[PDB]
Design a protein around this ligand. Structure first.
Ligand SMILES: CCCCCCCCCCCCCCCCCC(=O)OC[C@H](COP(=O)([O-])OCC(O)COP(=O)([O-])OC[C@@H](COC(=O)CCCCCCCCCCCCCCCCC)OC(=O)CCCCCCCCCCCCCCCCC)OC(=O)CCCCCCCCCCCCCCCCC
Ligand SMILES: CCCCCCCCCCCCCCCCCC(=O)OC[C@H](COP(=O)([O-])OCC(O)COP(=O)([O-])OC[C@@H](COC(=O)CCCCCCCCCCCCCCCCC)OC(=O)CCCCCCCCCCCCCCCCC)OC(=O)CCCCCCCCCCCCCCCCC
Ligand SMILES: CCCCCCCCCCCCCCCCCC(=O)OC[C@H](COP(=O)([O-])OCC(O)COP(=O)([O-])OC[C@@H](COC(=O)CCCCCCCCCCCCCCCCC)OC(=O)CCCCCCCCCCCCCCCCC)OC(=O)CCCCCCCCCCCCCCCCC
Ligand SMILES: CCCCCCCCCCCCCCCCCC(=O)OC[C@H](COP(=O)([O-])OCC(O)COP(=O)([O-])OC[C@@H](COC(=O)CCCCCCCCCCCCCCCCC)OC(=O)CCCCCCCCCCCCCCCCC)OC(=O)CCCCCCCCCCCCCCCCC
Ligand code: HEA
Ligand code: HEA
Ligand SMILES: CCCCCCCC/C=C\CCCCCCCC(=O)OC[C@H](COP(=O)(O)OCCN)OC(=O)CCCCCCCCCCCCCCC
Ligand SMILES: CCCCCCCC/C=C\CCCCCCCC(=O)OC[C@H](COP(=O)(O)OCCN)OC(=O)CCCCCCCCCCCCCCC
Lengths: 92, 139, 79, 145, 552, 203, 54
């Protein structure tokens, strides 16, 4: 009971018509709520590329290169799964 | 609440019997007399069940038959305002993290980390305990 | 004893058995009904599917009432 | 009044507690789960832009298909802003029904488009793909309120 | 006359609907699901360690594992699979179904049970963190005997991390046991008298009593060991009774620990059998009495693991071991009677239940052979014991846990697991398990004890070790079908829109919507027997339920 | 918002109507105390097995137990137990103030017990006996110091519950919290009675 | 997820102790609405206004 409902009038400014929708992000119109999927996929691929090229260096062991290969592989697998699902329409 | 108490009474009886027989058969017929490890463990698990069963028996004597203890009890008999059941709370995970910090400080002998973990544990237990009592901020 | 032989055994016998059992089981008709052929008559009971897409304002059924179907158009087709 | 033929009992409140034998399923819909999921996507987020509850009725709608389509639309939770596509493959008959809320939003023009897409798909020999195509076409036709 | 339902339910759910709940969730069902998922992840980790050990053991030489690496492997594998997969997943199943089975809205102390889950998870993480240390995890076996565990022997930080991680996990388990005893004692349906609640809740209550009896001893022993390591506290100095002190304390813990690992899944199987047999659990009162006797005797026969120490009252513990073997036989015959003369349908849950019966029977034969000190002397601390306890465990917490998952997955998901995948998974698991662990009886009978990284080519047990490796990799592949089934059936998979996806259910968790409502119930039936849901769904049967009951 | 959806006078009430049904907080704390009894059982087993293995003089020559500082601390712990019980007696009523007074004096006496135990530890270590020093020293220090950690946890519970009583209206839920804290303190003093009898009297 | 927590608080209201309904065994959280209550028990859902919710 000890509270009063708030009325917030904030200036809005893209119009949010395209991108994310309030059903997915309930505060879509209250601030930045959408990162394009393309930038996320490109960043994941670049992270995998960095991990792979990081095998290039002044280290004699190979456990390190194996961990780098595994992490790059899992990153690329996640990116591929997301991209394939979105291409097919989030199926399987 | 007779059955609950009676269960622990039966467990107490068995554990007392086991402790007594182990002590008697280990004080004699053993290479070093009473083991003092199994015997004490049996005695104090008898005490465990004794504490629980004594509390349950006191409660059962003090308590009139609940529907939960009553056969032929209709569901509507148990209807009513059940007590408070702590809703969503993030203090348990913080308590766990603080205890993990203290635990690593114990394992890795880092007295500073042990002290920090103890402080975190106290703070998080305070948060958990006071979560549903912290009055509104008065400004 | 014959490192190559037993390594191949431990690597293959699991895989071979897995493939055999997958053929045995995964190649069996499932409990899901077979797809309804267009030629065959519609035997299933009437189906109505809805989106649950738009917000319903209140959740509680009470106070929703039955104002009207208020039909706003129509269309038809014969395949 | 009668519960399911076996193993379903009316509980204290309105809700019915039903059961099935261990082997069989419950939904029993005669379509692959993948195509049911695709149609669900078409109805759920393939329609959010429409902001009009989209419904599909595969059952048989006999007699005057229009009136029974109206009656079926009455079964939709929000028939006023709702677009229902009811197809009877026994009668080879499609119908589409809307309410007073979806008026002037492009629903009328998308009516023949959705019906034509469904009919083309059905004659090509696939009910579900026709349903999904009609839902997509009508949803894209209806601008949000 | 027809309802507007969706073509297919939500698969994944709207974005960001789970993370904050997992962090903050107080509901017992979601916490039980997290228990199941995390415990299965730890099972995968421990099984990977097992496959490493087995690949090394297929060869007389040290192909890729150093002696201490292999020792850390079996140590952390045993500890992960006992204290970090099984003792948590018993409480995972508890949180999952026990509040439902007694007609309760939630657990007694929901914040306490969430704390128990998190304490467990982070204790497991810190215990596993021994591997990342340069020295590695704990070298000393799961048992962690005294003089080998002091600072002088095994001075590594992995040992200390193991000690404290087991301590934290034990605190979590103690909190869970307190919570479950309080829930069963206090929270219970208006008609659910103590003697008509399901066998699973009886088993969980007795298991929690055993948890409180045992785990505090583990905490005391581990804290004493930590004091010995970090302070030179002479607690377990062999010149004191230190070695036998630790033996007695740790086994007084662990033996009740194996029985808390077993009893909950005995309860799961006791729930499985009646529903797929279409008849009541045979000798319900007999099952509860057998569970009570099992716990009572387990608390006091701890020292049959110390037959070869030459320092225990062997006749006393052998007699108690036989006395506790008898109640397990009573329970086994109750299960068989429950299966007896019913319209048996072998879906994946009861396939796993029957597999439990088959494997656990041989495990118990091995146990009764081991109970005799004269026999244990030869077969002690050997691969015969490995085969014994792997049969009993893998039967009681892998086959039984798989049965429980395949049983309550619909009641916790609203979706049915694929049955054909269940068939494939069960048969792969059965074949692989029997191939990997059957030969180990002969392997350990002929001289080859446990905890050997390698063995001489001139020695025997080489073909049998590679047979065991074929079996272990059969199990490894067998795990893939189940993981795929769960992953593709949580979000996809045959929706179940009604209670009792496994018809002819009972035990009152099938009186509520198949995805149980928050607070588990919108309606409670007339609780009048041990099978409220069976009576509700089949009212006509109620009279029969009372007519033939006494005939036996 | 008109009056309330749940007609409860406090955001938190007793987890059960204790008049007719068991109070889950009390049951849970009793169960947990019974488990901590087994923890102290492990400690006692350590001490006793060490006792069996001494050459007839269980307190080594360097160690000599000081009853002068040992009897007063056990007496003060018994007094703190009694004052905690009167604090409970106040708690069952609406008198949050009496509960606070009794629990404050109980906290002061428990703190005095802790300081006395620390002083006795300082005297003991200064006169030889020490955890790395000897088996008796180590078992004695382990047992008594784990009990001291339990006492310090009880002091933490006392202060936390007094703060909780400050921050909200005294309700049957806070009365239950006070009762369970009293149960814990009674368990602590009982295990101390046992530890003092075994360490100092029985020896 | 925090946004969804706020939205569900607005839709349903704060949470409290549990009650077993009289006729049947229904368990309900006994929420507490923050705004006007509909003719029946459930309240009109409040619209998020960018401020913290209780
Ligand atoms: C310096 C800066 C460098 C930064 C590099 C650039 C990247 C920056 C941002 C990118 C991160 C991000 O947000 O990615 C999201 C993005 C997905 O887009 P989205 O729209 O957010 O997700 C839509 C779907 O929901 C997609 O998700 P989904 O829910 O449909 O499926 C996820 C999950 C479904 O699972 C869940 O969501 C439920 C949680 C699982 C249950 C619990 C697990 C077990 C725990 C027990 C263990 C205890 C012991 O299913 C699976 O487990 C996958 C099955 C097979 C996987 C095959 C690939 C391996 O992922 C990518 O495509 C980029 C991947 C790049 C890898 C990043 C490296 C670490 C990974 C962190 C991100 C997690 C990936 C999300 C899945
Ligand atoms: C350092 C590492 C940092 C860890 C973070 C790594 C990646 C970020 C994950 C974000 C954290 C999170 O919980 O969000 C889930 C996050 C999705 O975000 P969300 O808010 O949950 O999204 C809501 C969903 O749209 C809607 O969700 P929903 O409520 O319907 O639940 C759907 C979901 C989950 O179903 C549930 O209800 C899950 C409940 C139990 C799972 C959580 C247990 C663990 C709790 C402890 C930590 C939680 C915090 O069911 C699935 O189908 C999941 C996949 C199938 C699992 C079965 C496979 C057998 O999941 C991901 O996309 C990442 C995958 C999870 C990574 C864990 C596994 C990594 C390593 C695997 C090795 C395990 C063995 C050895 C260790
Ligand atoms: C060394 C040994 C030191 C031992 C000290 C522990 C003393 C505890 C006995 C006091 C009685 C008590 O807990 O009554 C609960 C009592 C009533 O709670 P409630 O909110 O009315 O119950 C509502 C339900 O919880 C509804 O929601 P709920 O699920 O939260 O249930 C409440 C209650 C559940 O009630 C209980 O189960 C009470 C006792 C059961 C488990 C107690 C475990 C506590 C310590 C375990 C660690 C092993 C040693 O759980 C709590 O809120 C208790 C917090 C426990 C945190 C665990 C730390 C890890 O809460 C209090 O007002 C007293 C709690 C104060 C605890 C402070 C202890 C801090 C220890 C660190 C000190 C450092 C010294 C050494 C270094
Ligand atoms: C570096 C220095 C950093 C800054 C340190 C500042 C220290 C005090 C700042 C302001 C003091 C204040 O507010 O007092 C007036 C304050 C009135 O202000 P208020 O607006 O009512 O307080 C805000 C809350 O509403 C009050 O909440 P409540 O009264 O409803 O109950 C909640 C409780 C919350 O406190 C708790 O966490 C309670 C549980 C205690 C945990 C202790 C367990 C650890 C071991 C203890 C036993 C084991 C042995 O808060 C209090 O305890 C209030 C008393 C003030 C002391 C704060 C805690 C100490 O309290 C009084 O009526 C008088 C008490 C004054 C004594 C406090 C002396 C402590 C500091 C000594 C020297 C300063 C540090 C130098 C180093
Ligand atoms: C779930 C786990 C679990 C379960 C249920 C059991 C159950 C039993 N265990 Fe188990 N045991 C372990 C886990 C388990 N154990 C582990 C993990 C070890 C590790 C040791 C180590 O590494 O240190 C171990 C070790 C272990 C040993 C030590 C061997 C050695 O190290 O030398 C012994 C006996 O010596 C034993 C005996 C028993 C007995 C008699 C039972 C019985 O309770 C159950 C089986 C017996 C039955 C009798 C059931 C069948 C009954 C019938 C068919 C009825 C009719 C038959 C007759 C009347 C004979 N166990
Ligand atoms: C629950 C308990 C449990 C379970 C299930 C198992 C399962 C298995 N155990 Fe067991 N084991 C013990 C408990 C258990 N064990 C104990 C307590 C000891 C004694 C410890 C000691 O003495 O210290 C022991 C000891 C032990 C030894 C003795 C080692 C030695 O002393 O030298 C061996 C040897 O092969 C072994 C093998 C196996 C195998 C092959 C399995 C198989 O059933 C395992 C199946 C494995 C899988 C299904 C993994 C496949 C999964 C993947 C490939 C995916 C991996 C992915 C990720 C990790 C992300 N175990
Ligand atoms: C599932 C896989 C399971 C695989 C399990 C296999 C583990 C076996 C590893 C070690 C066993 C003990 C041996 C210890 C000795 C090391 C072996 C060796 O001797 O090989 C030569 C170099 C040193 O040679 P050098 O003197 O420095 O000079 C050389 C001159 N040019 O080490 C190496 O190659 C290191 C190779 C070791 C294998 C890789 C292990 C890391 C794999 C990580 C996977 C994680 C994936 C992450 C996913 C996100
Ligand atoms: C787990 C803890 C770690 C492992 C378990 C330890 C349990 C111990 C419990 C209580 C004992 C405390 C009493 C302390 C006072 C006893 C007096 C004594 O022991 O003698 C002085 C010696 C020097 O002896 P000296 O070199 O020979 O020099 C002779 C000078 N002439 O100090 C010492 O080592 C004693 C210091 C011990 C400090 C322990 C701190 C405990 C707090 C831990 C917090 C919780 C962690 C959570 C983990 C999950």
């Amino acid at each position: 009971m000890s509270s009063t409902q708030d009325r917030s009038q904030l200036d809005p400014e893209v119009e949010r018509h395209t991108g994310v929708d309030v059903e997915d992000v309930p505060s879509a119109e209250w601030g930045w709520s959408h990162m394009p999927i393309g930038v996320m996929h490109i960043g994941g691929l670049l992270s995998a590329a960095f991990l792979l090229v990081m095998m290039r260096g002044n280290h004699v062991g190979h456990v390190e290169d194996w961990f780098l290969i595994g992490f790059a592989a899992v990153i690329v697998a996640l990116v591929g799964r997301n991209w394939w699902l979105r291409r097919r329409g989030w199926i399987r | 609440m007779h059955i609950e108490a009676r269960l622990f009474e039966i467990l107490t009886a068995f554990f007392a019997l086991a402790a007594v027989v182990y002590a008697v058969l280990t004080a004699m017929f053993a290479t070093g007399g009473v083991e003092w490890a199994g015997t004490t463990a049996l005695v104090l698990t008898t005490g465990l069940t004794l504490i629980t069963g004594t509390f349950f028996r006191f409660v059962a004597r003090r308590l009139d038959t609940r529907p939960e203890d009553y056969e032929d009890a209709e569901i509507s008999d148990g209807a009513g305002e059940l007590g408070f059941f702590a809703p969503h709370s993030w203090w348990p995970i913080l308590i766990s993290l603080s205890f993990s910090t203290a635990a690593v400080g114990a394992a890795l002998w880092l007295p500073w980390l042990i002290a920090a973990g103890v402080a975190f544990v106290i703070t998080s237990v305070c948060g958990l305990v006071f979560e549903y009592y912290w009055g509104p901020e008065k400004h | 004893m014959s490192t190559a032989l037993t390594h191949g055994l431990i690597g293959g016998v699991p895989l071979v058995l897995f493939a055999v059992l997958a053929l045995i089981f995964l190649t069996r008709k499932g409990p899901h009904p077979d797809t309804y052929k267009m030629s065959d008559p519609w035997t299933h009971a009437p189906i109505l599917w809805a989106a649950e897409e738009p917000r319903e304002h209140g959740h509680g059924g009470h106070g929703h009432d039955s104002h009207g179907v208020v039909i706003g158009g129509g269309a038809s087709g014969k395949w | 009044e009668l519960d399911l033929p076996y193993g379903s009992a009316l509980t204290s409140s309105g809700r019915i507690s039903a059961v099935t034998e261990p082997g069989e399923l419950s939904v029993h819909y005669p379509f692959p789960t993948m195509d049911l999921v695709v149609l669900d996507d078409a109805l759920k987020y393939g329609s959010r832009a429409a902001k009009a509850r989209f419904a599909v009725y595969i059952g048989p709608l006999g007699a005057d298909t229009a009136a029974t389509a109206r009656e079926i639309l009455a079964n939709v939770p929000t028939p006023e802003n709702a677009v229902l596509l009811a197809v009877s493959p026994d009668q080879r008959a499609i119908e589409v029904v809307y309410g007073a809320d979806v008026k002037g939003r492009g629903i009328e023009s998308a009516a023949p488009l959705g019906v034509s897409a469904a009919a083309a798909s059905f004659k090509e020999g696939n009910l579900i793909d026709g349903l999904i195509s009609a839902v997509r076409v009508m949803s894209a036709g209806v601008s949000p309120a | 006359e027809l309802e507007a339902r969706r073509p297919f339910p939500e698969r994944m759910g709207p974005k960001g609907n789970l993370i904050y709940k997992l962090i903050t969730t107080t509901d017992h069902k979601l916490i039980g699901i997290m228990y199941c998922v995390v415990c299965f992840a730890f099972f995968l980790v421990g099984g990977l360690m097992a496959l490493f050990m087995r690949t090394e053991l297929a060869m007389p030489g040290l192909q890729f594992l150093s002696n201490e690496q292999f020792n850390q492997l079996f140590t952390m594998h045993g500890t992960v699979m006992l204290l970090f997969y099984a003792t948590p997943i018993v409480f995972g199943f508890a949180n999952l179904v026990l509040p439902l089975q007694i007609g309760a809205p939630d657990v007694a102390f929901p914040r306490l049970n969430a704390l128990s889950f998190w304490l467990f998870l982070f204790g497991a993480l810190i215990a596993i963190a021994g591997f990342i240390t340069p020295g590695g995890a704990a070298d000393f076996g799961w048992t962690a005997y005294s003089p080998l565990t002091d600072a002088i022997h095994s001075p590594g930080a992995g040992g200390d991390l193991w000690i404290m991680g087991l301590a934290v996990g034990g605190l979590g388990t103690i909190l869970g046991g307190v919570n479950m005893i309080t829930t069963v004692v206090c929270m219970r349906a208006p008609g659910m008298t103590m003697f008509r609640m399901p066998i699973f809740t009886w088993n969980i209550l007795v298991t929690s009593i055993l948890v409180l009896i045992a785990f505090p001893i583990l905490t005391a022993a581990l804290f004493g060991l930590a004091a010995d390591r970090h302070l030179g506290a002479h607690i377990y100095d062999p010149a004191n009774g230190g070695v036998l002190l630790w033996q007695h304390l740790f086994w007084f813990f662990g033996h009740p620990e194996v029985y808390i690992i077993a009893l909950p899944f005995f309860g799961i199987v006791s729930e499985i059998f009646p529903v797929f047999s279409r008849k009541p659990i045979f000798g319900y009162t007999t099952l509860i009495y057998a569970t009570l006797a099992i716990a009572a005797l387990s608390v006091a026969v701890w020292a049959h693991h110390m037959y070869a120490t030459g320092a225990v009252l062997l006749p006393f513990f052998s007699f108690m071991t036989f006395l506790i073997a008898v109640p397990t036989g009573i329970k086994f015959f109750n299960w068989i009677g429950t299966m007896w003369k019913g319209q048996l349908t072998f879906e994946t849950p009861m396939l796993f239940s029957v597999g439990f019966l088959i494997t656990f029977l041989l495990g118990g034969l091995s146990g009764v052979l081991l109970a005799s000190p004269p026999l244990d002397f030869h077969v002690t601390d050997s691969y015969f014991v490995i085969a014994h306890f792997h049969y009993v465990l893998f039967g009681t917490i892998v086959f039984a846990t798989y049965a429980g998952i395949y049983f309550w997955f619909p009641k916790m998901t609203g979706r049915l697991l694929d049955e054909r995948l269940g068939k494939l998974h069960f048969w792969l698991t059965f074949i692989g398990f029997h191939t990997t662990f059957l030969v180990q009886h002969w392997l350990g009978d002929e001289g080859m004890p446990r905890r050997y990284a390698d063995y001489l080519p001139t020695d025997g047990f080489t073909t049998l070790n590679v047979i065991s490796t074929v079996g272990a990799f059969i199990l490894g592949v067998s795990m893939l079908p189940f993981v795929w089934n769960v992953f593709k059936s949580w979000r996809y998979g045959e929706p179940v829109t009604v209670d009792d996806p496994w018809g002819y259910g009972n035990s009152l968790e099938w009186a509520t919507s198949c995805p149980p409502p928050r607070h588990n119930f919108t309606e409670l039936p007339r609780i009048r027997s041990e099978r409220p849901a069976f009576e509700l769904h089949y009212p006509h049967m109620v009279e029969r339920m009372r007519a033939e009951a006494h005939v036996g | 918002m008109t009056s309330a959806v749940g007609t409860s006078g406090t955001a938190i009430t007793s987890r059960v109507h204790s008049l007719n049904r068991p109070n889950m907080v009390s049951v849970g704390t009793i169960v947990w105390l019974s488990s901590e009894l087994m923890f102290f059982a492990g400690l006692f087993a350590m001490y006793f097995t060490a006792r069996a293995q001494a050459g007839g003089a269980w307190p080594p020559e360097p160690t000599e137990l000081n009853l002068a500082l040992a009897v007063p601390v056990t007496l003060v712990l018994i007094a703190s137990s009694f004052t905690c019980q009167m604090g409970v007696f106040a708690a069952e009523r609406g008198d949050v103030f009496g509960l606070r007074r009794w629990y404050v004096i109980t906290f002061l006496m428990g703190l005095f017990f802790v300081l006395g135990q620390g002083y006795e530890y300082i005297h003991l270590v200064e006169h030889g006996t020490t955890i790395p020093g000897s088996a008796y020293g180590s078992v004695f220090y382990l047992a008594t110091g784990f009990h001291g950690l339990h006492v310090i946890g009880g002091l933490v519970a006392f202060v936390l519950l007094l703060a909780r009583t400050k921050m909200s209206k005294f309700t049957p839920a806070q009365a239950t919290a006070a009762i369970v804290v009293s149960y814990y303190w009674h368990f602590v003093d009982i295990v101390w009675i046992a530890l003092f009898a075994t360490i100092y009297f029985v020896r | 997820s925090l946004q969804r927590s706020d939205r569900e608080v607005l839709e349903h209201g704060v949470e409290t102790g549990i009650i077993k309904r009289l006729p049947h065994g229904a368990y309900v959280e006994l929420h507490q609405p923050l705004g006007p209550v509909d003719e029946h028990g459930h309240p009109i859902p409040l619209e998020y206004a960018g401020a913290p919710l209780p």
